[PDB]
Structure formats: structure tokens, C-alpha cells
A paper describes a structure:
The KATP channel is a hetero-octamer complex composed of four pore-forming Kir6 (kir6.1 or Kir6.2) subunits and four regulatory sulfonylureas receptor subunits (SUR1 or SUR2). KATP channels can sense intracellular ATP/ADP ratio using the inhibitory ATP binding site on Kir6 and the activating Mg–ADP binding site on SUR, coupling the metabolism status of the cell to its membrane potential. In pancreatic β-cells, KATP channels are mainly formed by Kir6.2 and SUR1, and play key roles in controlling insulin secretion. Small-molecule drugs that inhibit the pancreatic KATP channel are widely used to boost insulin secretion for the treatment of diabetes and are therefore named insulin secretagogues (ISs).
Residue numbers in the entry: 218 to 276, 283 to 329, 350 to 406, 413 to 616, 678 to 739, 768 to 921, 997 to 1039, 1060 to 1326, ...
């Protein structure tokens, strides 16, 4: 609430003080953050931008710039006016140091004390204009993002469906941010020229022509600073290529982990991910080189400029003798030109990226029922897709739209709606509940999807779910209801999704309903259930106009009207009779522990030795000004020794950063591979994967750079407070109060800012997610006429994004205003005490300048120390949670088919109910054993029990004379065939997905593919036995993929085969093909089949029934059918 408060509280952000103190105690919630001010709302900014657009266009890429300039120009020069005004008041430090030091070494301005309060007042007054300049630029930048995101969205509700779903979200998340961040750094575009030009002009007057030569070096090194920034960002992209390639290879490893650990291919796929990692680490060296140079230039160009400015002034020109006032006033000017001169690279880089974004943004912004005649074409001009489409469906009566495949069926429905440009014809036609041919699901609850922003009724909902008969399906789902169906509907199944969209159509209370192929993936049994109960007994009962378009003609007789489509034309439209007649410092220690004692010693000793040179340089200047070639000799040497150490301390932090980033990931990968199968099922995949994506990214690129920023600022602030204390020892008395105050300000910030950074991120996701939802189901939204209702949901989402981001900026300004006040209070104590000592005691004029030139800079170092420490705390969440995951568990480490089980006391998990108990069996070599039982009756345990994956087997299994327990895991899994229920084939060649051990012969591998009756399609692939297959994908069918897994099984030749519900998720013909292959090809080798199919184990040598723990296991299935009273298997079959 900055506008309401007065000028003083607004400048000092006193209104934020109570919020900070309150948030320190309890976490920030949406209730804690208030509603947005009227002036800064998404709707208000959007209306202002629309007014600007109307004004500009009333008389392209130029227009949007004019509208952005017109709407947000008044609150932008007001930001630039402060920035310029703060720049001029900035030179009241360097100029007043000139005044103070000169008077000591030699009209109220003639007094040294008077200038000590002018230095105090100007520094106090500058460091609020500068901060109020940052805020108003930010508050305009954030208010702009609110206006554009609404502007982008209001275009989405219009664009034709002929066209890029992911581009629009990218346009919101990246292209708008680059435009927003241009308005953060917009005033600098007019303030760098003013601040630098006055700066360089001042240096000439203070020091002479020699100040230009030193000033030219810094300016001339801005392009080289910029060039490194270009080479770095190129290197980051090339690293981003391998990281995305790595995450694909890792994701396939975690998802299909059970298949891998069954075949003992965990090491092979772990080896393949490391090969991609090493390439990423190679491309990450160049990112370290061009980050090392970037740190080297930013701390060795200021030193180089000082070296050439002073040495050149005394050696070449032989001008006026160097004096403490001139040398230290000029030195303090360099410290305040480098910050503008080194950010100018990022300002130009941002401006060239903002020019692209606007052009990219302006490219996006430019993109019953009776019909008379009618010609509709998806293209703006071309062959009309619908021709002679003249229809008149009745009101309140069901109508069927039936025709050939791909012949104007779904287009005609969209022709009735407004998504088809009319070449000609006349159409006259409220909101319509349209069940899309391709169903779309909101990223929300199953209850939310069906109600779809409509009031809930208990009776209505009960009938709908019973009619669609999707409730029994949700019963098997992991959650009873309110399941979070994310993007793409991965949680739900294809057939289940189709019902939901039809359920959404059937739930709504509207007169006209267009159900576009409700039975596309609906089973024939349920399809009649949905049609009879829902379409007829529910939809037709309510006197609701229903239009249905499906291939199943069985429901044609139960239809008032029916139309026939031919070649995209409505040939005839009549009734059935008419138609028939016509036709954490603990984590930081863990991070620095892995670097190595050698590097860690070199890292620490280089930092401490560098800042004993960067002070011994400045102290030597204070001794110099008071033989004159001798002083230049030592000062040149120290400047070179300062530069050399700036190179060493820039390589080491990056060299260390790679050494940890390499070891931490590699040590992480080898740990989860050895985790037992129980760990992967219990822990959600999202938890493990995000460690490899974000945390291994934060350590790769963010920690090493931040660790340098925090270590460089902390030592500078220690050096600044030591030099300023050696000059005036009385300053130590005031150091304790300013240490206690500076601690609490740091504490309340880190507590409050950490909350808002998390709150900022968690409100970003709903905003982007809403853009994806709108574009994916744009046709459905405009069918319900929920465009206005959906657009309103954006304003709430983006307002909760701005206010969460408008406190993160008011928190930073709160901190920087406090520290700059503390720093402006240190400069008074430093000035007051040194001048007291210099005039009365025997202090020198040079040491006075040395104290002041650090007092001015102790405000910045205090600010970087607390801001970097805030970021270093957050970025150490990467190491903290990796080290937690890194301590997971670790598993310990066939000639004849005789397998024996000793009581099989196997427990599905630690300290749980035993799945199977007291199960004794003995299968002779070369015998086909079958296992059948109820779902969850322990049959599924015996499948994984033979592979020691059940980690609590309190019994014994003897296979071919040995024990499956004593033998090591990677030597027992590798010699036992398995066929999981759901087939999976991982990315790689066919030769590298059927024998990754690279031991199979080329001729043999072809026979195995042919043995599975698969050689024809395999040979048909390009290359042959080397075609680059994709994970799942379309290169193979579901029957073929399950068929290929049989070929992979035949490759092992382990003489013991275990099949676990291979029949499921397969075709009936393929099951006969698979069963015939197993019966014929695998005649020997003791095939064991655990499945629910009746006919799978009918011909087996022996069949074992499974009760809660064990049931009758008749060796002869023929005897079992008679003995079981035709109940156990005969009745089930
Ligand atoms: N973005 C698009 N650009 C061009 N044509 C399009 C586009 N979207 C759809 N179409 C047209 O719509 C046709 C499919 O709809 P149509 O009603 O003609 O067939 P259908 O019988 O409903 O098909 P299906 O069984 O695939 O649902 C395509 O063949 C194409 O001519
Ligand atoms: O001190 C800072 O360096 C500023 C940090 C800050 O205030 N914010 C708030 C913004 C919210 C939206 C996204 C994050 C930014 C970061 C950034 C900045 C603003 C203006 C000028 C220079 C730097």
C-alpha cells in the first residue's frame, strides 16, 4: 500500500516493516498479502494499454512500441528522473572527499566538518532517490507484464483453430519476461550516458589528462566485457542441448526401472547416461572458462585502470605532484564509474533482446440450427472443405450425423459453430455443450472437470457418473476421487478420458448438445449403457437438442433425425423411413568437502591473499601521496600482483565448481541404481527426477558463481571495516551497535524474502498452466461460451502473481534502504572521527582519504553480503536435498529347470502383511507350470519372488541345485528369463535394445527376431537391426512391442522362463501368436505363466491355485476341474 502512505514512509518503506516482522513469525499466505491497488491491476493496465492502442492505431511492431511508450511512459520518466538525480547526488562523495582531505592537508564550505554532514546528507538523500528509482521502474515493469499477458490472452480467445500450443506459453514465460526486464533496466538507458559523462569530465578536472587514459581503459573494455557475455550465452545453450538429452535418457531409466532391474541392465543404462553426461560436462567447461574471464575482467579492469592512471600521471606527464586529496577523490570516482560501466553490457544485451520480443509478440497478435447454402474452408482462401452444406436439425430432437471417415463429420459440427470462415452461404442459429472428438481435460480434479465451472447438484451428478459408468474406473485409480488429472491425461486412460468429456457434455444444463463421436474409444458394452441411459433416458428425457456423430450405426434407429455425408456435402437429411425409401551450513560443508583439500586450500588461500593485496595497494597509495619513482615501482608491482591473484581466484572458484558438480551427480546416479525396487514404487518419480534436472543444474551453473559473489563481498566488507578502523580506532566503539543492527536487518530479510521467492514461484505455475489449457481446448471453450468466464479466471491468476511479485520487490528495497542508511551512517562516523584525529592528533591527510574512500563503499558491500547470502541459502537447497537422496538403501551383491520353494514366506515390504506364506512347490525340469488366482491374492508376488526383488523372503528357493538367495543379485537376475505384463522398449537401436551386453551373434539375433514371427517388420525397417527406435512410440505396435519382449527373452536362453500376465494389454490374435510361440519355440526351459487368462494355463503341465496364502495345486489340471466341483477354474472360465 505504497500510494496511501506519505512521502517519508514511501521512501523508506516503513509500511513494509510491520509486514516483515509479522512474516518472520508465521509463513506468508494469500490472506497475509492484501488485494491489489486499483491503479495496479491486470484489468486496469489492460484497459490503459487498449486505450493507448486505440489512440495510436486511429491515425505493427512500431504501434506496440508506441502503445507501450504511451501507456507506461509517464511512470517511466518519473523513474528515470530519480535515477539521473541520484547520479548527480552520487558525485557528492568523490567531490566532498576532495574537499575534506585537501583542507586537512593545507564561506561555510571551507570547514572540514561542514562537508562531513553534506557528505552524510547527500549520501542519505541519494540512496533513497536511487532506490525509489528502482521501485517505480519495477512497479511499472510488473504492471506492464500484467497488461501484456492479458493482451496476449485476449488474442487467444479469437485466433482460428487452423493453427503452436507450446509457443504461446513460451511467449508468456520468456518473451514477455524479456520485455518486462527491459522496463526494469529502461531508465539506465538514459542514465548511464549522464552518469559516465559527468564522471569522466570530473576525473579530468580532479586529476588531469592522465585520468582520461585510465577512464578510457574501463570504457574501452565494456565491449570486451560484452563480448564475453555473448560467448558465455552461446556456451550455455550448447550445454542446454546435452542436459535435455540427458534428462530423456535418465527419465527412461527411472520409469522402466522394474524392467531394467529384472534383466540386470541397470549398469548398461547407467553407463549410457554417463556418456551423455561427459559430453555435457565437456560443454560445461567452456561455460566455466567464459565465466572465469567474466569474473577476471570485473575485478582486474578497475585495478588496471588505477594502475595506469596514477603511474602514468607521475612518470610520463610529470604533472602536478600527486596529493592525498587528488589521488583519493579520483580513486573514489573509479569505484562509482565501474558499476555503471559494467552493467552497460547487460543493458545493451537486454535491449537487443527486447527488440526481438516485441517483433515476436507483434507477429503473434497479427494471426435449432438451419443453414442456407454454405461453403466453409479452414484456409482463409482455397478449396472449400464443406460444400453445399444445407441442413436443418430439429429442436429438442436427437439427430445423427453419419458418413464416411474423414468426410465433413466433425467439420460440419464446427461449421455450425464459429470456427469456420464462410466462403458463402447463410446460417442462422445459446451456448452449446460440445464433447470434442479429441477430449481435453483441465489440470484439475475429476469432480472439477465434470462440473466445469458450474454449480454442483448431488442428484444430477449421481445420474451422470452412473450413465457414463466411469465411477467404477475411478475406484481402481490411486485416489478415490478429486484425482489431479494433469496435462495430457497421463493419470487417466484413453477410454476413461473419452467418457469424461462426454460426462462434461451430459452434465451441463443447456438446450443444444454436440457430442462429437462419444464412442471413439468406448467399449461396445459401455457404449450402449451410455447411449441408452444418458443420450436417451437422460439427454433426450430433458427435451434437449442432441447431435451425435459416430461410426456405430446400431443406434441410428433410436434417432429422430439422421443425415448422410458424401464427399463433404450433405447429400440427404431425412428420417429413417425417408432415408430407406430414397436409398544449512551442514550442507555447505558437504559441498566444499567434495571439492578436495588441495583445491579448497588453494581457494581459501587465494581469496585471503588477494584481499591482503587489494588493501595493501590502497594503503600504499595513502603512504605514497605523503624518491617518487620508488613508490611507482612498488605500486606497479602490487597492481600486477593484484591482477595475477584476480586471475587465480577466478579460475579456482570455477575449477572447484566443476569438480564438485561432476562428482556430486556421478555419486548420485550410482546410488539410486542400487536402490531396491521398493524405493521406486514408494517414492514418486517426480521427487527423484527433479534432482537430476534442477538440483544438478543449480550446482552446475549457479552455486560456483554465487559462491564467488558471496566470498568476494564478505572479504571486501571485512577489508572495508578493517581499513576504516585502522584509520580511526574510535570507530570500533560504533561497530558493535552497527553489527547488531545489521544482523537483525539481515535476519528479518532472509526469513521474509525466502517466503516470497517461493510464493512468487508457486503462483507462476497456475498462470502458465492456464495459457496451455486455453489453447489446447480453445474450440470447447468458445462452444460453452465460457470465454468471458475463463478470461476472468486469468485476472485472478495474474493479480495473485503481481502482488506476490510486488512484495518481493518491496522487500528488497526495504533491505537496500536500511543498509544504505547504515552505510550512510558509517561514513559520518568515519568522517567525524578521522577529522577529529587529523586536526588535533597526529593523523595524516592521506589516511583520512583512505578511510573515506572505504566508508563510501561499505554500503554496497553490506548490501551484496546480505543479498548473496540470501541467494546462497536458497541455492544450497540443491546440495541439501541431493545429499538426502544420496543416502538411500542399496541391494546386497539355470542349467536345469528344477525349481523348489521352501515355505515361500515372502513379505511384500518391510513390516507388512505377508503376501504368500507356507507355499511349497517343486517343478520338474522341462515342465510348464501355471499359476492362477484372485487379483491381489498373492499371485503377483511369486512373479517377482524368483528374482529376489521381494526383500523379506523368510524361506528358501532352490533352482538347479543352488539357492536364489546366496547367489549375488547381478549374477542371478542375469540368468533368469522374465516377461513383464506391460511391455516397454527403451530408446536405442534394435541391436542395442535386444542384446545390450553385445554378446549375441549377428546371425543368432536375426533368428530370435524371426522366432517371434517378427523378422518381416524388422527387415522392413530402414537399415535393419540398426533402426533407431524410440521409447514406446509408433515404430512398433502394442502387440509387436509385447512380441519383441518375447524376442528379448529368447535371447537370454536362461532355460528358465517366467511369464507374468503377458496376455494383458495385448491383442487376441497376438495372444494366440504368443502362446503358439511359447509352446513351440520355448518347448523346454520350464515356462511359468502367472496370468488371469483362463486359456493361458489350460494346456500347462501343472496349474497351482493361489488363495490368500496358498490353495490347491493339482499337478493334472484335468483332475482339478472335476475335483473342484467345477468352481475354482471351470466356473471362472
Ligand atoms: N487445422 C486444420 N487445417 C485444415 N484442415 C483441417 C484442420 N482441422 C481439420 N481440418 C479438416 O477437417 C477434416 C476432418 O474432419 P471431417 O469432419 O471432414 O472428418 P471426420 O469424419 O469427422 O473425421 P474423423 O473420423 O477423423 O473424426 C480434415 O480432413 C481436414 O480437411
Ligand atoms: O535488486 C535487484 O537486483 C532487483 C531485484 C528485484 O527487485 N526483483 C523484483 C522483481 C520481481 C519480478 C521478477 C524478479 C525481479 C527481481 C532487480 C533489479 C531491478 C531494477 C534494476 C536493477 C535490478
Amino acid at each position: 500500500l505504497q500510494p496511501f502512505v506519505n512521502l517519508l514512509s514511501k521512501g523508506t518503506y516503513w509500511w513494509m516493516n510491520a509486514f516483515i516482522k509479522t512474516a518472520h513469525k508465521k509463513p506468508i499466505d494469500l490472506r497475509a498479502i492484501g488485494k491489489l491497488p486499483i491503479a495496479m491491476r491486470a484489468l486496469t493496465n489492460y484497459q490503459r494499454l487498449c486505450v493507448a492502442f486505440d489512440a495510436q492505431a486511429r491515425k505493427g511492431a512500431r504501434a506496440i512500441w508506441r502503445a507501450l511508450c504511451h501507456a507506461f511512459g509517464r511512470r517511466l520518466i518519473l523513474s528515470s528522473t530519480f535515477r539521473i538525480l541520484a547520479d548527480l547526488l552520487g558525485f557528492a562523495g568523490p567531490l566532498c572527499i576532495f574537499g575534506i582531505v585537501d583542507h586537512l592537508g593545507k564561506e561555510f564550505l571551507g570547514n572540514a566538518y561542514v562537508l562531513a554532514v553534506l557528505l552524510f546528507l547527500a549520501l542519505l538523500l541519494q540512496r533513497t532517490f536511487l532506490q525509489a528509482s528502482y521501485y517505480v521502474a519495477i512497479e511499472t515493469g510488473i504492471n506492464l507484464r500484467g497488461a501484456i499477458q492479458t493482451k496476449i490472452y485476449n488474442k487467444i480467445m479469437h485466433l482460428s483453430t487452423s493453427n503452436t500450443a507450446g509457443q504461446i506459453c513460451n511467449l508468456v514465460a520468456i518473451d514477455t519476461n524479456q520485455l518486462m526486464w527491459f522496463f526494469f533496466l529502461c531508465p539506465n538507458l538514459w542514465a548511464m550516458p549522464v552518469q559516465i559523462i559527468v564522471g569522466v569530465i570530473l576525473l579530468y578536472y580532479i586529476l588531469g589528462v592522465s585520468a582520461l587514459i585510465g577512464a578510457a581503459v574501463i570504457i574501452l573494455l565494456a565491449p570486451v566485457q560484452y563480448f564475453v557475455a555473448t560467448k558465455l550465452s552461446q556456451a550455455q545453450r550448447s550445454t542446454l542441448e546435452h542436459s535435455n538429452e540427458r534428462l530423456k535418457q535418465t527419465n527412461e531409466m527411472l520409469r522402466g526401472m522394474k524392467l531394467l532391474k529384472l534383466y540386470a541392465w541397470e549398469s548398461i543404462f547407467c553407463s549410457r547416461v554417463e556418456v551423455t553426461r561427459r559430453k555435457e560436462m565437456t560443454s560445461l567447461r567452456a561455460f566455466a572458462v567464459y565465466t572465469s574471464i567474466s569474473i577476471f575482467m570485473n575485478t582486474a579492469i578497475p585495478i588496471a585502470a588505477v594502475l595506469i592512471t596514477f603511474v602514468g600521471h607521475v612518470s610520463f606527464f610529470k604533472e602536478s605532484d600527486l596529493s592525498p586529496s587528488v589521488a583519493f577523490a579520483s580513486l573514489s570516482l573509479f569505484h562509482i564509474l565501474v558499476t555503471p560501466l559494467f552493467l552497460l553490457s547487460s543493458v545493451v544485451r537486454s535491449t537487443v533482446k527486447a527488440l526481438v520480443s516485441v517483433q515476436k509478440l507483434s507477429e503473434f497478435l497479427s494471426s435449432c440450427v438451419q443453414i442456407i447454402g454454405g461453403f466453409f474452408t479452414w484456409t482463409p482462401d482455397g478449396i472449400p472443405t464443406l460444400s453445399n452444406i444445407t441442413i436443418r436439425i430439429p429442436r429438442g430432437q436427437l439427430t445423427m450425423i453419419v458418413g464416411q471417415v474423414g468426410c465433413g463429420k466433425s467439420s460440419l459440427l464446427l461449421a455450425t459453430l464459429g470456427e469456420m470462415q464462410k466462403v458463402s452461404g447463410a446460417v442462422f442459429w445459446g451456448p452449446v455443450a460440445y464433447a470434442s472428438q479429441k477430449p481435453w481435460l483441465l489440470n484439475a480434479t475429476v469432480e472439477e472437470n465434470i462440473t466445469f465451472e458450474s454449480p454442483f447438484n448431488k442428484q444430477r451428478y449421481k445420474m451422470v457418473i452412473e450413465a457414463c459408468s466411469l465411477q467404477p474406473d475411478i475406484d481402481i485409480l490411486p485416489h478415490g476421487d478429486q484425482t489431479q488429472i494433469g496435462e495430457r491425461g497421463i493419470n487417466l486412460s484413453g477410454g476413461q478420458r473419452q467418457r469424461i468429456s462426454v460426462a462434461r457434455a451430459l452434465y451441463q444444463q443447456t438446450n443444444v448438445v454436440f457430442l462429437d463421436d462419444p464412442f471413439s474409444a468406448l467399449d461396445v458394452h459401455l457404449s450402449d449403457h451410455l447411449m441408452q441411459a444418458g443420450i436417451l433416458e437422460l439427454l433426450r428425457d430433458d427435451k434437449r437438442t442432441v447431435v451425435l456423430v459416430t461410426h456405430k450405426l446400431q443406434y441410428l434407429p433410436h434417432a429422430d433425425w439422421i443425415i448422410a455425408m458424401k464427399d463433404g456435402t450433405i447429400q440427404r437429411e431425412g428420417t429413417l423411413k425417408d432415408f430407406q425409401r430414397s436409398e544449512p551450513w551442514r550442507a555447505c560443508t558437504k559441498y566444499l568437502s567434495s571439492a578436495g583439500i588441495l583445491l579448497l586450500s588453494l581457494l581459501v588461500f587465494s581469496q585471503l591473499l588477494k584481499h591482503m593485496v587489494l588493501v595493501a595497494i590502497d594503503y600504499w597509495l595513502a603512504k605514497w601521496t605523503d624518491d617518487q619513482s620508488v613508490y611507482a615501482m612498488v605500486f606497479t608491482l602490487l597492481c600486477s600482483l593484484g591482477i595475477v591473484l584476480c586471475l587465480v581466484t577466478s579460475v579456482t572458484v570455477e575449477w572447484t565448481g566443476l569438480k564438485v558438480a561432476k562428482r556430486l551427480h556421478r555419486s548420485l546416479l550410482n546410488r539410486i541404481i542400487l536402490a531396491p525396487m521398493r524405493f521406486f514404487e514408494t517414492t514418486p518419480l517426480g521427487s527423484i527426477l527433479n534432482r537430476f534436472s534442477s538440483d544438478c543444474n543449480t550446482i552446475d551453473q549457479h552455486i560456483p558463481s554465487t559462491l564467488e559473489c558471496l566470498s568476494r563481498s564478505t572479504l571486501l566488507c571485512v577489508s572495508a571495516l578493517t581499513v576504516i578502523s585502522y584509520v580511526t580506532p574510535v570507530f570500533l566503539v560504533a561497530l558493535l551497535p552497527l553489527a547488531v543492527v545489521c544482523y537483525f536487518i539481515q535476519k528479518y530479510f532472509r526469513v521474509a524474502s525466502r517466503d516470497l521467492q517461493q510464493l512468487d514461484d508457486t503462483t507462476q505455475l497456475p498462470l502458465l498452466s492456464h495459457f496451455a489449457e486455453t489453447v489446447e481446448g480453445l474450440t470447447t471453450i468458445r462452444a460453452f461460451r465460457y470465454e468471458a468466464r475463463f478470461q476472468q479466471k486469468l485476472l485472478e491468476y495474474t493479480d495473485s502473481n503481481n502482488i506476490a511479485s510486488l512484495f518481493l520487490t518491496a522487500a528488497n528495497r526495504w533491505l537496500e534502504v536500511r543498509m544504505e542508511y547504515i552505510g550512510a551512517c558509517v561514513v559520518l562516523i568515519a568522517a567525524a572521527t578521522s577529522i577529529s584525529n587529523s586536526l588535533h592528533r597526529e593523523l595524516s591527510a592521506g589516511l583520512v582519504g583512505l578511510g573515506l574512500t572505504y566508508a563510501l563503499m561499505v554500503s554496497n558491500y553490506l548490501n551484496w553480503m546480505v543479498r548473496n547470502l540470501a541467494d546462497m541459502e536458497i541455492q544450497l537447497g540443491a546440495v541439501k536435498r541431493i545429499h538426502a537422496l544420496l543416502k538411500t538403501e542399496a541391494e546386497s551383491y539355470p542349467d536345469q529347470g528344477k525349481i523348489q520353494i521352501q515355505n515361500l514366506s515372502v513379505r511384500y515390504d518391510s513390516s507388512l502383511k505377508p503376501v504368500l506364506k507356507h507355499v511349497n512347490a517343486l517343478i520338474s525340469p522341462g515342465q510348464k507350470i501355471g499359476i492362477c488366482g484372485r487379483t491381489g491374492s498373492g499371485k503377483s508376488s511369486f512373479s517377482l519372488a524368483f528374482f529376489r526383488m521381494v526383500d523379506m523372503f523368510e524361506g528358501r528357493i532352490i533352482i538347479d541345485g543352488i539357492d536364489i538367495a546366496k547367489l549375488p543379485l547381478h549374477t542371478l537376475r542375469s540368468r533368469l528369463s522374465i516377461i513383464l505384463q506391460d511391455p516397454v522398449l527403451f530408446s536405442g537401436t534394435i541391436r542395442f535394445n535386444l542384446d545390450p551386453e553385445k554378446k549375441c551373434s549377428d546371425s543368432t539375433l536375426w533368428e530370435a527376431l524371426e522366432i517371434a514371427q517378427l523378422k518381416l517388420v524388422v527387415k522392413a525397417l530402414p537399415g535393419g537391426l540398426d533402426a533407431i527406435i524410440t521409447e514406446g512410440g509408433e515404430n512398433f505396435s502394442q502387440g509387436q512391442r509385447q512380441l519383441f519382449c518375447l524376442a528379448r527373452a529368447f535371447v537370454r536362453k536362461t532355460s528358465i522362463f517366467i511369464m507374468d500376465e503377458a496376455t494383458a494389454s495385448i491383442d487376441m490374435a497376438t495372444e494366440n501368436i504368443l502362446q503358439k510361440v511359447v509352446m513351440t519355440a520355448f518347448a523346454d526351459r520350464t515356462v511359468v505363466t502367472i496370468a488371469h487368462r483362463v486359456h493361458t494355463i489350460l494346456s500347462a503341465d501343472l496349474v497351482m491355485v493361489l488363495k490368500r496364502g496358498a490353495i490347491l495345486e493339482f499337478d493334472k489340471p484335468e483332475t482339478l476341474l472335476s475335483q473342484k466341483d467345477s468352481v475354482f477354474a471351470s466356473f471362472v472360465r
